[PDB]
Amino acid sequence: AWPKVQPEVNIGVVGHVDHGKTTLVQAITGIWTSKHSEELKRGMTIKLGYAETNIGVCESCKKPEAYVTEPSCKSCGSDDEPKFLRRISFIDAPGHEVLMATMLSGAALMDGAILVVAANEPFPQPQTREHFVALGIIGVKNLIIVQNKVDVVSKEEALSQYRQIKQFTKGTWAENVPIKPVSALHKINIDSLIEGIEEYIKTPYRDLSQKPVMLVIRSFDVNKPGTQFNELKGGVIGGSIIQGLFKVDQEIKVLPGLRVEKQGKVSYEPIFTKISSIRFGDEEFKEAKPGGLVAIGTYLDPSLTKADNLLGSIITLADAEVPVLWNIRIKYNLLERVVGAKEMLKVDPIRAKETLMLSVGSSTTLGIVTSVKKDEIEVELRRPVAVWSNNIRTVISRQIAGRWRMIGWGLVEI
Numbered sequence: 001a002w003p004k005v006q007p008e009v010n011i012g013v014v015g016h017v018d019h020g021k022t023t024l025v026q027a028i029t030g031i032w033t034s035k036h037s038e039e040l041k042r043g044m045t046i047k048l049g050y051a052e053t054n055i056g057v058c059e060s061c062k063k064p065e066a067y068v069t070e071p072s073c074k075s076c077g078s079d080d081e082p083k084f085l086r087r088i089s090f091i092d093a094p095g096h097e098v099l100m101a102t103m104l105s106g107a108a109l110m111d112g113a114i115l116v117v118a119a120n121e122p123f124p125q126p127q128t129r130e131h132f133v134a135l136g137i138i139g140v141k142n143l144i145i146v147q148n149k150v151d152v153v154s155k156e157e158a159l160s161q162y163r164q165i166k167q168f169t170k171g172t173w174a175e176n177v178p179i180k181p182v183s184a185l186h187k188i189n190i191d192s193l194i195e196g197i198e199e200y201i202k203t204p205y206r207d208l209s210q211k212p213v214m215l216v217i218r219s220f221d222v223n224k225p226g227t228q229f230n231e232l233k234g235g236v237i238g239g240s241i242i243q244g245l246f247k248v249d250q251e252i253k254v255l256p257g258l259r260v261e262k263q264g265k266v267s268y269e270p271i272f273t274k275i276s277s278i279r280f281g282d283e284e285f286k287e288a289k290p291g292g293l294v295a296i297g298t299y300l301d302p303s304l305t306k307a308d309n310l311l312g313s314i315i316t317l318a319d320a321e322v323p324v325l326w327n328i329r330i331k332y333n334l335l336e337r338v339v340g341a342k343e344m345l346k347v348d349p350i351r352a353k354e355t356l357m358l359s360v361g362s363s364t365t366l367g368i369v370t371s372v373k374k375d376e377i378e379v380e381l382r383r384p385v386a387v388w389s390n391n392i393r394t395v396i397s398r399q400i401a402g403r404w405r406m407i408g409w410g411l412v413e414i
């Protein structure tokens with residue numbers, strides 16, 4: 001039988017709106033990531049979606065068909081159990097331009113990524129470019145480009161687009177990134193994509209001695225409405241461990257923590273709690289490592305975790321030393337152009353007093369520029385940000401025509 005383990009690797013799925021990201025995740029895992037009523041109603045991804053699958057291989061069968069996502073080799077005529085390789089999970093990002101920040105948040109949790117490009121739309125669309133560049137900046141460079149929807153165009157049309165994709169990636173870090181043509185909807189050529197995932201998105205080395213840090217993207221409770229008070233389960237916090245590992249019964253804290261109101265005055269205080277449970281998908285565990293999206297059960301009042309209240313927080317062990325900053329200095333670089341805009345636009349230099357959006361880990365925060373130099377800016381933040389390490393990358397966005405657009409990136413200087 002196959003072991004029940006946590007996913008050991010996170011693969012982002014990104015790309016322009018409606019290019020088929022969520023359907024691709026479904027093709028691979030059997031799961032539809034959109035769980036929220038607003039997502040199902042509007043027919044779009046809004047929150048980061050999530051799905052897991054085991055990956056195995058039928059050792060006595062031809063590849064790529066030999067790769068499977070379930071413990072059966074019958075499709076290649078064998079009754080032998082396939083060899084288990086690893087469990088993997090997908091971080092399914094929204095494609096809508098208005099949701100770029102969510103993509104940025106998700107990118108902090110990715111070990112590698114799939115850029116989905118629809119074969120029946122002109123390449124390169126605005127969020128194809130924006131998501132691509134964001135991946136480059138954040139360092140998610142174990143990339144596979146998936147040409148999706150090949151079922152509705154001829155082979156030669158798909159090939160014309162393939163040539164365009166090679167041209168686009170030529171001279172960039174992605175020059176030799178593989179391109180896999182598939183139909184996510186009708187499940188065509190999926191095995192080849194699985195093989196590509198095994199080949200090009202290998203599980204990275206994890207130094208489990210590092211101080212445990214988790215980036216938070218969800219928070220909620222499992223309390224059915226009309227639940228008795230003596231039955232109210234504690235709040236649950238969801239996210240991905242980026243370094244180290246957590247264990248049941250550990251004393252932890254959420255940073256920056258809770259917003260505190262003292263007659264108009266607002267500060268933040270760390271939330272201290274204890275891990276009462278650890279879950280990945282449907283399975284419970286005693287410890288949680290990088291890879292996968294973990295649900296940490298706590299003793300927190302569920303009101304504190306309700307409705308993703310803690311999105312953007314980090315979690316550490318209670319005694320960790322972590323700067324929680326209301327002002328940050330960033331060593332920055334600007335892009336030449338606003339890549340996510342429909343019409344070509346130059347990036348104006350950063351100006352003092354302008355309000356920028358900073359993406360740091362899973363957090364998204366507005367701040368006012370208080371100092372501008374050639375290589376550095378200083379920013380007064382509207383809400384504080386937890387800075388758990390010395391070389392954290394931030395992505396900088398500017399509001400252009402009412403839309404937040406990525407314009408640059410930097411290193412948060414300690």
Ligand SMILES: Nc1nc2c(ncn2[C@@H]2O[C@H](COP(=O)(O)OP(=O)(O)CP(=O)(O)O)[C@@H](O)[C@H]2O)c(=O)[nH]1
Nearest residue numbers: 017018019020021022023044045095149183184185
């Ligand atoms: N013909 C065809 N249609 C597809 C394929 N993959 C997805 N679609 C269709 O495209 C539409 C959008 O699919 P969806 O998977 O939700 O795309 P998405 O990129 O996740 C949308 P968002 O950017 O908001 O998250 C749906 O109608 C879906 O059935 C494909 O391989 N072939």
Ligand SMILES: [Mg+2]
Nearest residue numbers: 021022044045
């Ligand atoms: Mg989607």
